[PDB]
Write a protein that binds this ligand. Structure first.
Ligand code: NI
Length: 376
């Protein structure tokens, strides 16, 4: 039974023999390397007294993926100061009041706040919503907008479900199949965006009129991951059609950066809502696939396992997510090896560090029993 029921979170590092003191130190150090004055590793930058952002170092932009991640990280770490700086920047610079995506958040901005696009990215929205619910539950709603956290979360999720009913907009979930979309104006998906464990919580906390819908989305997503992951290797493509097969129209049909999050998501869902045979077997498959592969040699792979020449752009992120996946298969043949590999991998430096380092801190939090559900 998951932590949602027991309110106890597995410390897999401790279970695998790491000392409580060293785990405590490693979690804090990871946070400090990302959010402190450590220029080589840092991904969070403060602006003035009331703003801050996470920089996508690989593209020199600020993304809703990173901002929503940063808010989730901040609430897990009980850092309301950092949470509010990020959310303030997000509302000021990313929230759209105009155009077909009004009510969503521009997916990419320049560090100066300028929007690079008026299109949103659904995985940002869903993390914003849950981070905001957690903020409300830990700290209470603030007296002034936009710090009225729970109202902001419910409003945002309303738009995600109902957009287009009285306007030219589009929802972020397909209403018939209850699957999250890659972007509001398409009818395909992205396996890594599927967060059934988040939807379970939305089914408790969203507007009441949408709570059954969120239960249905959770179930739809669980079923969808079964058909999206390759049956032998466990690898999921970056984009996939609703029928579960890869969408490679623009090169996203393979196992690469986006896909890495699937193992992590499966890990977290197992920890929160309970183990399943499917999830354990799926994590066993991915870990078995990587068991005989050197991190320095990790590639892009077709989902059936065929290697490309191209190396993984984010191999530290791949390590972190595979290790986090161990939460879904704690007795798995490679579970300990994956956790140990991660323990022995430093936080990344250099221009591609943002994505790896986000996945890294999530894995550090989850594997130490510090990626929690914050209840009212
Ligand atoms: Ni120490």
């Amino acid at each position: 039974e998951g932590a949602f029921y027991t309110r106890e979170y597995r410390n897999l590092f401790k279970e695998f023999g790491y000392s409580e003191a060293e785990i405590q130190e490693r979690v804090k150090d990871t946070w400090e390397q990302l959010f402190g004055d450590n220029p080589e590793t840092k991904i969070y930058y403060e602006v003035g007294d009331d703003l801050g952002y996470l920089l996508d170092t690989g593209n020199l932009d600020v993304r809703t993926e990173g901002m929503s991640y940063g808010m989730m990280m901040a609430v897990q770490m009980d850092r309301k100061d950092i949470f509010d700086r990020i959310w303030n920047w997000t509302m000021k610079n990313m929230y759209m009041t105009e155009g077909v995506h009004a009510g969503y958040f521009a997916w990419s901005c320049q560090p100066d706040g300028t929007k690079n696009s008026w299109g949103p990215a659904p995985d940002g929205e869903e993390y914003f919503a849950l981070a905001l619910f957690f903020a409300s539950h830990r700290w209470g709603d603030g007296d002034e907008q936009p710090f009225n956290y729970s109202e902001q979360a419910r409003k945002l999720l309303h738009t995600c479900v109902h957009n287009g009913e009285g306007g030219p907009g589009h929802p972020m979930w397909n209403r018939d199949n209850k699957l999250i979309k890659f972007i509001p104006e398409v009818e395909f998906s992205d396996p890594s965006y599927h967060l059934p464990h988040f939807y379970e919580l939305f089914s408790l906390w969203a507007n009441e009129e949408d709570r059954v819908f969120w239960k249905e989305a959770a179930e739809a997503s669980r079923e969808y991951l079964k058909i999206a992951c390759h049956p032998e290797t466990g690898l999921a493509p970056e984009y996939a059609y609703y029928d579960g097969t890869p969408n490679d129209e623009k090169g996203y049909g393979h196992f690469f950066s986006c896909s890495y999050r699937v193992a992590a998501n499966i890990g977290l869902d197992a920890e929160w809502f309970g183990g399943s045979e499917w999830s354990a077997e799926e994590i066993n498959k991915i870990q078995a696939f990587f068991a005989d592969k050197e991190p320095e040699d990790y590639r892009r792979y077709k989902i059936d396992g065929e290697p490309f020449e191209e190396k993984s752009l984010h191999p530290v992120g791949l390590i972190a997510t595979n290790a986090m996946g161990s939460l879904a298969s704690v007795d798995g043949p490679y579970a300990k090896a994956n956790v140990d590999l991660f323990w022995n991998t430093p936080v990344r430096t250099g221009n591609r560090r943002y994505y790896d380092n986000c996945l890294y801190l999530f894995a550090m939090l989850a594997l130490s029993g510090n990626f929690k559900i914050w209840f009212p």
